[PDB]
Each structure stands twice: as structure tokens, then as C-alpha cells.
Amino acid sequence: QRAYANVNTSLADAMAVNILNVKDARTNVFWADDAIRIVSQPIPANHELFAGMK
Amino acid sequence: MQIKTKGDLVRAALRKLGVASDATLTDVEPQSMQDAVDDLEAMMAEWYQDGKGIITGYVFSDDENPPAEGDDHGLRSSAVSAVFHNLACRIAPDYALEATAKIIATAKYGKELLYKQTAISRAKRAPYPSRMPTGSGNSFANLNEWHYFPGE
Amino acid sequence: MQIKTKGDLVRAALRKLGVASDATLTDVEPQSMQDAVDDLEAMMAEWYQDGKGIITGYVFSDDENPPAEGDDHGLRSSAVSAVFHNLACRIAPDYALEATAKIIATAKYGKELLYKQTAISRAKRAPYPSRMPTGSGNSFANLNEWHYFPGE
Amino acid sequence: MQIKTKGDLVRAALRKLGVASDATLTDVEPQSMQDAVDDLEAMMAEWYQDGKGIITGYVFSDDENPPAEGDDHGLRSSAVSAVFHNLACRIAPDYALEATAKIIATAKYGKELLYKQTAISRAKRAPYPSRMPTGSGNSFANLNEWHYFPGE
Amino acid sequence: MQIKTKGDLVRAALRKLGVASDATLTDVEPQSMQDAVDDLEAMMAEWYQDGKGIITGYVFSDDENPPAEGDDHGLRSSAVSAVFHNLACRIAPDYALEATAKIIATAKYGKELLYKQTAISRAKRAPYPSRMPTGSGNSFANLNEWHYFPGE
Numbered sequence: 154q155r156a157y158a159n160v161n162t163s164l165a166d167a168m169a170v171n172i173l174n175v176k177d178a179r180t181n182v183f184w185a186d187d188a189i190r191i192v193s194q195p196i197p198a199n200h201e202l203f204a205g206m207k
Numbered sequence: 208m209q210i211k212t213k214g215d216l217v218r219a220a221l222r223k224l225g226v227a228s229d230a231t232l233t234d235v236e237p238q239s240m241q242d243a244v245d246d247l248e249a250m251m252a253e254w255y256q257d258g259k260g261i262i263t264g265y266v267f268s269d270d271e272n273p274p275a276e277g278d279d280h281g282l283r284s285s286a287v288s289a290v291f292h293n294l295a296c297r298i299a300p301d302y303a304l305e306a307t308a309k310i311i312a313t314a315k316y317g318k319e320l321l322y323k324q325t326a327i328s329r330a331k332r333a334p335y336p337s338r339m340p341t342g343s344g345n346s347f348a349n350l351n352e353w354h355y356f357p358g359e
Numbered sequence: 360m361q362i363k364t365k366g367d368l369v370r371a372a373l374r375k376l377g378v379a380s381d382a383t384l385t386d387v388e389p390q391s392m393q394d395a396v397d398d399l400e401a402m403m404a405e406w407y408q409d410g411k412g413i414i415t416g417y418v419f420s421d422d423e424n425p426p427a428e429g430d431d432h433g434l435r436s437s438a439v440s441a442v443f444h445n446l447a448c449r450i451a452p453d454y455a456l457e458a459t460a461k462i463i464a465t466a467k468y469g470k471e472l473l474y475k476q477t478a479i480s481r482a483k484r485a486p487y488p489s490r491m492p493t494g495s496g497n498s499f500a501n502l503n504e505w506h507y508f509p510g511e
Numbered sequence: 512m513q514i515k516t517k518g519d520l521v522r523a524a525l526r527k528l529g530v531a532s533d534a535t536l537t538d539v540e541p542q543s544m545q546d547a548v549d550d551l552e553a554m555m556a557e558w559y560q561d562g563k564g565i566i567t568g569y570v571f572s573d574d575e576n577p578p579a580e581g582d583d584h585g586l587r588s589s590a591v592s593a594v595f596h597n598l599a600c601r602i603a604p605d606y607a608l609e610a611t612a613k614i615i616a617t618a619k620y621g622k623e624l625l626y627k628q629t630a631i632s633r634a635k636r637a638p639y640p641s642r643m644p645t646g647s648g649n650s651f652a653n654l655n656e657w658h659y660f661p662g663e
Numbered sequence: 664m665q666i667k668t669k670g671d672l673v674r675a676a677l678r679k680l681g682v683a684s685d686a687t688l689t690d691v692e693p694q695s696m697q698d699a700v701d702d703l704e705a706m707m708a709e710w711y712q713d714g715k716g717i718i719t720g721y722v723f724s725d726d727e728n729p730p731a732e733g734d735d736h737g738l739r740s741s742a743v744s745a746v747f748h749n750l751a752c753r754i755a756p757d758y759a760l761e762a763t764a765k766i767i768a769t770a771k772y773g774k775e776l777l778y779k780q781t782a783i784s785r786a787k788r789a790p791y792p793s794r795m796p797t798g799s800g801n802s803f804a805n806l807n808e809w810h811y812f813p814g815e
Binding site for chain 3: 512513514523526527528529532533534587588589590591592593611613614617621624627628
């Protein structure tokens with residue numbers, strides 16, 4: 154379990170959280186290309202709706 | 208119909224057993240009537256197994272309203288006979304009695320008629336398994352790529 | 360329900376036995392109540408075989424509370440009738456009586472109804488054997504190269 | 512549980528048989544109590560065939576501590592009813608008595624429930640015979656030259 | 664065990680029969696004790712057919728020992744109930760009585776449990792016939808010229 158550690162210490166009682174966004178701004182977004190994926194399926198034919206619809 | 212309350216059901220059961228009626232000269236005490244009402248409630252709770260038993264429309268009184276007796280049972284007109292016959296059968300033990308053959312037969316017949324309609328409703332057929340094809344006869348289903356039955 | 364305590368259960372059992380009820384002008388004796396409560400505890404421990412028996416929601420008292428009487432049984436509303444009928448049948452030999460056929464049949468029916476739901480729940484199918492192939496029709500199994508069922 | 516000693520089991524058995532209890536005006540002598548405790552020990556030793564019979568956790572008394580009565584039997588909560596019902600059945604003939612039908616039926620049911628779990632655990636399947644090949648599909652065995660199942 | 668001698672076995676048998684016990688108001692009769700001890704010795708001898716019958720651990724008294732009563736029987740803890748129940752059944756006709764159904768059933772059960780382990784031990788399979796080959800698979804024996812089983 155220790156092999157998955159991503160921070161040096163844990164959350165110990167009275168630690169202060171800091172909100173990093175303090176003034177409104179339009180964001181800029183960077184990523185690794187595989188970090189965001191899209192799942193797409195056709196509407197199931199056996200649905201209650203789409204009953205007699207071609 | 209005159210048997211409108213749990214007290215009425217208990218009185219009918221006692222009249223069937225021959226213990227108390229309107230023509231008698233000695234009557235059972237209200238404590239005994241309350242005990243019989245509690246036995247009726249227990250019997251109906253045992254029958255109606257929290258929705259998976261025999262559905263009749265019986266209403267279970269709450270302890271917030273003090274007297275359970277005096278509340279309308281809510282049964283249909285066709286279940287009163289069965290309910291109070293079964294109640295007489297259940298509460299005959301208390302007075303060192305034994306319900307007669309006619310009472311027992313009527314109790315069995317009434318319970319059977321009580322569950323007949325529920326059994327007819329519950330006799331349902333499961334849908335097609337998830338591994339049936341719909342078949343090519345269903346051209347409309349074929350054109351929509353509905354090639355197998357969903358299941359569940 | 361007005362039956363909410365082990366004492367109410369014991370009183371109902373004694374009423375059904377005819378030992379002590381208002382209809383017989385006999386009051387319940389504390390020396391007969393402690394024995395009946397001990398029997399009820401023993402019967403429930405025998406039924407609920409440490410989790411592998413007839414689950415009823417019964418609450419077992421502890422030695423910390425001196426009077427076992429007065430504690431709520433915790434039984435669901437659909438179990439009390441069966442439980443007190445069985446208790447009456449079990450404690451009849453203490454007074455050297457014989458529970459009548461109606462009480463015996465009611466105890467049998469109630470015990471069966473008690474175990475019905477747990478039997479339905481426990482009627483489960485074992486998983487596929489570790490040596491069966493998954494077939495070539497399962498897209499996800501083919502993708503993950505899971506040619507054989509996990510087993511166990 | 513309220514019953515925590517061999518004498519408690521014996522007194523419960525006498526209560527069932529109707530010979531003596533906490534309300535009776537006549538009682539049985541301590542020598543009879545000791546005889547009943549001896550019969551209980553003999554019956555438990557007969558059941559527990561040196562570990563090859565019925566396992567219940569009963570703790571056999573030792574002669575260094577004088578009174579066999581007074582020791583915790585060590586039984587689980589689910590075995591007390593069975594043990595004292597069979598004890599009552601066994602010691603009924605002493606008082607020119609006969610255990611009743613309900614007591615006998617409960618004794619049989621209790622003994623069956625006592626051995627149920629041990630029977631389930633003892634229902635084991637023997638390993639493969641020493642002349643059975645492991646098959647060529649058993650890759651690890653074939654590589655390690657375990658062509659045949661290990662005999663035992 | 665608190666039953667350690669032939670006298671304890673005889674006293675238990677008489678108590679079971681109701682001839683002499685503290686449950687009644689009779690003491691064990693000295694002349695009856697000797698006859699019961701003789702019957703017990705005969706029954707052990709008849710059971711244990713000089714080593715080819717039921718093995719129990721019973722120790723047979725000799726002419727040198729003055730009192731037959733007082734010697735430790737030597738039985739294991741799991742045979743006492745069977746021994747003294749069978750003894751009671753056998754010595755009942757001396758007093759023109761008849762042992763009750765529970766006593767007879769317990770005697771049968773005890774004798775069966777007594778012979779269970781010996782039957783398991785004697786359930787042994789005969790060796791291979793001397794005319795059976797060992798098969799070419801038995802490389803060691805076939806090289807050592809043991810082409811057939813030794814038998815006998």
C-alpha cells in the first residue's frame with residue numbers, strides 16, 4: 154500500500170486548508186492526452202421509449 | 208355489513224364459539240376482549256408477511272391512538288367471514304375449547320378464497336432469457352438491431 | 360402491537376395454555392414468569408444457532424441487567440404469534456399439561472413462516488466451476504482474455 | 512444465559528419433569544441432585560466419544576475440586592435446551608416417571624441441531640487416489656514432474 | 664467420573680430401576696448388591712467373548728480378592744452409561760419388574776456406541792490374492808522379481 158503514496162504526510166487534525174482560486178478568472182486547461190476519455194453507446198433498441206419509432 | 212371494527216370481529220368470533228353473544232346472560236370481560244383483539248392483530252401480522260403474505264386491506268392500529276379495538280379493520284365485505292372464523296379457531300384454546308368441524312372447515316375455505324385472487328395475480332411468467340434471439344420474424348426489431356431479448 | 364416485551368410473550372403463552380388468564384380468573388405468578396422467561400431465552404438461543412438458524416431479530420438480554428423481564432424482545436410484528444405459540448407448547452410440560460392440536464399446528468405453521476424468507480434468501484446458486492470456458496460470445500471476456508471462469 | 516452450571520441444568524430438567532422447581536412446596540434431596548449430576552456427566556461422556564462423537568464444549572469435572580455441581584458446564588447458548596431436555600428424558604425413570612411426548616420431541620430436535628454443524632464440518636471429501644494422473648493441462652505440476660496426484 | 668466401582672454401577676442401575684434410590688425412600692440392600700454384582704460380572708463376561716467381542720476395559724475380579732464390590736471397574740468414561748443401563752435391564756426381572764422404554768432404548772444406544780469403534784477398527788480389507796500380478800507399473804517389485812502379490 155505504501156508504494157502508491159503521493160504526499161509526504163497525512164491529514165493530522167488542525168491543518169489549515171487554503172483555497173487556491175481566490176479571484177474569478179477564465180481557466181486554461183492542460184493535460185496528458187489520455188487523461189480524458191469519451192464513452193459512446195447507441196440508444197438501446199429495447200428501451201421503453203423509442204417503442205414504435207424507426 | 209355490521210362487522211365494521213376489530214371489536215366486532217372479536218364479538219363475532221365469540222358468538223361462533225358460543226362463549227358470548229347478544230342473547231347471553233354472562234359476558235367475557237373487556238380485558239379478555241382486548242387480549243382477543245391482540246390475538247387478531249398478531250394473526251393478521253403473521254398472515255400479511257410485511258407485504259409478501261396474504262393481502263386483504265387490514266389496517267394495523269398504532270399505539271399512539273390508545274384503543275386498538277374500535278378502529279375499523281378495513282377488510283372487504285368478502286373477507287370478514289374468513290377473518291373472524293380464523294379468529295375463533297385461534298382463540299378457542301383460551302377457554303379450554305376446541306373449534307368444531309364446521310368452524311375449521313369454514314376457516315380453511317375462507318383462507319383459500321382470501322388467497323385465491325393474490326395467487327392468480329402472482330402467477331406471472333418470467334420474461335425471455337437474455338440468450339434468446341428475437342428472431343427474424345420481428346422485422347421491426349431486426350431493423351433496429353434488437354437481435355436478443357434483454358432479460359431480467 | 361401491544362405485545363412488546365418478554366413478559367407480554369409469556370403472558371400470551373400462559374393465556375393460550377389456560378394456566379393464567381383473565382378468562383379463567385387466574386393471575387400470572389412470578390415464579391411461573393421467571394421459568395417461562397428462562398425457557399424463552401433457551402428456545403431463542405437454540406433457534407438462532409449463533410447466526411446460522413432462524414433469524415428473528417430477537418434481542419438476547421445480558422447478565423448486566425438483573426431483571427430479564429421488562430426488556431423488549433425486538434421481534435418483528437410477523438413473528439410474535441409463532442414465538443408465543445411455540446413458547447406455550449414448550450412450557451406446557453412444566454405444569455404437566457398438553458398443548459392442544461390447534462396450538463401445536465399453529466406453532467408448526469408459524470415456525471415454517473418464520474423460516475420461509477431466510478430459506479428464500481439462502482437458496483443461492485454456486486458460481487461457475489473453475490474449469491468451465493467462458494465461450495467466445497462474451498465480448499468483455501474475449502477482450503480481457505478470460506477464457507475460463509474464475510471459479511470458487 | 513441464566514443456566515450456567517450442571518446443577519442449573521439438573522434443576523431445569525427437574526422443572527421440565529415437574530418434580531421440583533422454585534415454586535414447589537416439596538423438594539428433592541441433595542443426594543438426588545448429585546445422582547442427577549452424575550447421570551448428566553455420564554450422558555455427556557457417552558455423547559463425547561473421546562472427541563470422536565458430539566462436540567459441545569462441555570467441561571468435565573475433576574475429583575480434586577470436590578463438588579461436581581457448581582462448575583460451569585461450558586456449553587454454548589444454543590446447546591443448553593438440548594442438553595437439559597435429554598437430561599430430563601434420561602433421569603425421568605429414576606422417579607418412576609416418563610418423559611412426555613413434547614419433551615421427547617424437543618430432545619430429538621435438540622440433539623439433531625447439536626450434531627448439525629459437526630456433521631457439516633466432518634462431511635469432507637478424500638483427496639485424489641495415488642494412481643490418478645494430474646493431466647497435461649496442469650502446467651505447473653507437469654513442469655515440476657508431478658505427473659500423478661500425491662498419494663496419502 | 665464419580666462412578667468408579669462396581670458398587671457405583673450397581674447403585675446407579677438400582678436407582679434407574681427404582682428399586683433403591685434417594686428419590687424413593689429405600690436404601691440399597693446388601694443381599695441384592697451381591698446378586699447384582701454377580702449379574703454384572705456375567706454380563707461383562709458374555710459381552711467380552713474372551714477378546715473377540717466388545718472391548719470395554721472392564722477388569723474381571725479373581726478368587727483372591729475378597730469383595731467383588733469395591734474394585735474399580737476400569738471402564739472408560741464413555742461406557743459407564745451403557746454398562747449400568749444394561750445391568751438395570753438385566754437385573755429388573757429379579758424383582759419381578761420391567762425396565763421402561765427409555766431405559767431399554769438407552770441400553771441399546773449405549774451398546775451400539777460401545778461397539779462402534781471396535782467395528783471401525785475391524786473393518787479391515789483383506790490383502791491381495793497371491794495369484795494377482797503386481798503389474799508392470801510397479802518397477803521396483805518387477806525388477807526385484809515380485810511379479811505377484813505375497814497374499815496370505
